[PDB]
């Protein structure tokens, strides 16, 4: 689709949000850049007022899905870049479990060669003492997200991407004929007598773990290795000529529980044009929250990678 | 210590609970066996009344810590088996966050060669549409516990233990010169050119130094010292000399079906049933791993529990 | 194991070394006693020739690992005391970074009730103005070792052990409303208003996942797995079945006087002196802490050594 | 002294260095701000050429000592701010042990309200395979510096400063009548029988550690606590109307040793004016090296605190 070509390279991003939550007024401004080729997003956000009413993770989602990486086979389903350069409007309602709701309206458009995202956010009935207003959330986007980075050295340069768990792996340690596997003592066993296959029993799946590598630390001691909703669900909305998306975010609260955020969103094109009405699909998002060490004002540094499926 | 010898082998276990939660009467009876040598507990519980008003995970804790494996150096701190064969009494108060409370009193004693744990439970101020009374909990003991089993075939027989899942592992897939590491697209790379080592950058972790001592040298002058101590899911056990027993604290994060977790604040105290020299333990804790399953051919509301407890 | 019983108590030790470093002949003789129960080694060494061409820390290692304390679970891996009373032979090669090398052969055996360690040492290609021959080293075994002693009075007698200095501690000084924490000016603060907890932010540490297995699915396609293993200063000991002995590796960072450190790459191998069933150990290591002092009333070039070795 | 008043507040800093080491040409440009009140320095440096010939720690020193915090009693000895706003010239010779030398000439002056530091650096005979050119240094300024940060919450805001060791502290753990103190087993002892004072024997000082706090973990088990060249040496140089300074930097190299850097420097005022000729004293410096997480070009983020004595 024409209009996605302006996302071939890196695009500068400017985000401007004005929010008032339960009588607390604030405004956030963020700048950075997005590489739609890999789904890379590097942004820095600052509260212009100073005082932060809500914790960053609640509005991380609310704070440019056009930079989502759409693989080639579904390139005919990317509504976001097809709405560009005229842009689209994104309306969100975020219901926090045992708390109030956010209602947000944003315009994502192109100003010259920059990508501007302007938001109006309002909080309706949020408890003044709660996980939201009490900043009790653990500076984490979702509970299933590892906030770690993974650096792969390739051709002299390290490539850094968020870290997902792609499979299950269990290590076995045999000492003088006694086996300890996954923090449990399995009793007497000889290192040579370690099985080639081990089984794991999930409430629905029977997984088989095969021995990958073994190393002998002694005559009878050694080590062996055995190995084998969250996403944003997007559907089309022909009557409004846009898309409707649903998802849930489980913010880690400090006391061990999680705060639920039900995101219901709908996007409609800003100007008359032929947008791509997609099939039902989803976006997988991975986020890493850090802070600028030399920065003193209340800020957030975001690294985000989105892919489609 | 005498009285711990009765746990050298496998011991048959009988658990009997009569509960009343928000005016809902029920009774659970369970049978099985425990091997204190490995900390193994294998039991099957059935609701005799039939329909269970609260979900099984809420009562897993209330439904025999004597079978906890105490290592040799801590064998002088196992109060539970030292109270035997006369037994002890276990009083629990379970405060559920944003919900009611359980108050339970149980007697754990030896009846003949069987180990009987008899419980009276009462649940108060429970929301009828709450997670507890609504069975909204996800049939999981704790959120950090994987309810999976790990079976290792050894010497012709498979040995089954709970899954701890503490390892870290990343898989790399190179297809036609493009690399995918842990479900992410890393770009162009050749398989032979894959690096021998990869690095992971964990989030900055903040070591906490607590104020140890303070001394005031003046009206607005003084000195303070901050230091890191030598030491959430585990059951923290302390002695209670004045009552000649033990007091334990912990928290359990039950998985709620919608993705959240329900907190259960367990505050318990155990005191010996009969006059005797019990072991007054030092501060320690029990690490517990539990697996909940169901008999596919069973019709009554039931729970099959496998549990492993260790001390530290 | 038989032969380790000879180390139940304190054993008198005699060490005798004849060395030739770059054509410089010298001889060191040392006496003392070792308590294998605690890993204690207390010796006094004197250069019989008088002036020592190389500094004492270089020869501390070359100058009886049988006195290393092996815990109960590792008592089947202590090759040194298992080779006794016939003894073993210890061959060492010490490569000093940007300097020459030591080649040493020693016999550690039992002469009567004494434990004798006899050494032949040869030093080759040493810079005459180098750190070694110039005595530029700072009379320290390793740079991470504090040469301090810690004396705890217990039951009327002080017990002395080397200082490990592994704790972290920060002191706060408030003067007239201004705060100083760890030698830094933190600005205005009131002593009563001092926080209960302070946080320290350590530098980002990079966990390393090594490639465990690789399998090629095509010309430019394959799969790789990266994982973190379960496990520098310590002496790493491995078995050597083909030679029926052990081989050990380690590195020692001697403190140079100008602030730098001189590296000493120790590669050693021990083989039993007499025919017998020695213990072929699993891979393990020895953690060593040494304290070097001098007798103030002594005139000959000497060294007083206190050493504690443990296994893991 | 007049002219130090312009350092009462925060001053923007711009650093420009052109270096050629053993035929490798590069240029570094850095920007940030310095607060002379507390000695705070927050800077970010970037290699403009791309390819970094030498590791950052070697030139960290070479890359604005006017921001050094001089306490009140020695405020008559601060030559640096007394040379301002006209500035001074700083000449350095840095001899690396078992390697060549750096020769650097810099002008530290005021351009408007900004503080400009312009440097010419040249490396004479540095081994191509060495700790310097091989980037073998451990991203650490000095071996005695802990690269950690210490955050003290005061009045709702955390103050972050480099972490020094101000005293010696030893913890004792008694379990069932056996004592382990500072990673050593002292044998049998009862927790109630723990001594009030412990002694430490240094090669020159006999330190006494008193018990600070004790906590009982059981009937006979518990824990107790016992507690009790690098700097830049500056002298005056009347004949040249400036100062001469000496110091040594022990960079941690990766293999465990340290690389020595002998800094010999001299500062002379740029313009005719009454500078302060100081008594012999020294500056204590603490540095923390980090990196901007969203930054990809070869960069360094520096936090530095200097005090006088």
Author numbering:
A (entry chain A), D (entry chain A): 2 to 64, 68 to 232, 242 to 322
B (entry chain B), C (entry chain B): 2 to 64, 68 to 235, 242 to 322
Publication excerpt:
Our next strategy was to crystallize the cytosolic carboxy-terminal domain (CTD) of batCOV5-M (batCOV5-MCTD) and solve its structure, which may serve as a searching template for molecular replacement of the full-length batCOV5-M. Interestingly, four batCOV5-MCTD-sfGFP molecules assemble into a tetramer in the structure, consistent with its oligomeric state in solution as verified by a cross-linking experiment. In the batCOV5-MCTD-sfGFP structure, the MCTD domains swapping β strands with each other, resembling a “butterfly” shape. Three monomer conformations of MCTD were then extracted from the tetramer: conformer 1 with the β sandwich split into three parts, conformer 2 with two parts, and conformer 3 as an assembled MCTD (batCOV5-MCTD-xtal). Though it is tempting to postulate that domain swapping of CTD may play a role in regulating the M–M protein interaction, further investigation is required. Meanwhile, we tried to solve the full-length batCOV5-M structure by molecular replacement using the three CTD conformations as templates, and eventually succeeded with the batCOV5-MCTD-xtal structure. Meanwhile, alignment between the batCOV5-MCTD-xtal structure and CTD of the batCOV5-Mxtal structure yielded an all-atom RMSD of only 0.5 Å, indicating that the individually expressed CTD of batCOV5-M protein preserves its structure. However, it is noteworthy that the CTD dimer interface in the batCOV5-MCTD-sfGFP structure is different from that in the batCOV5-Mxtal structure.
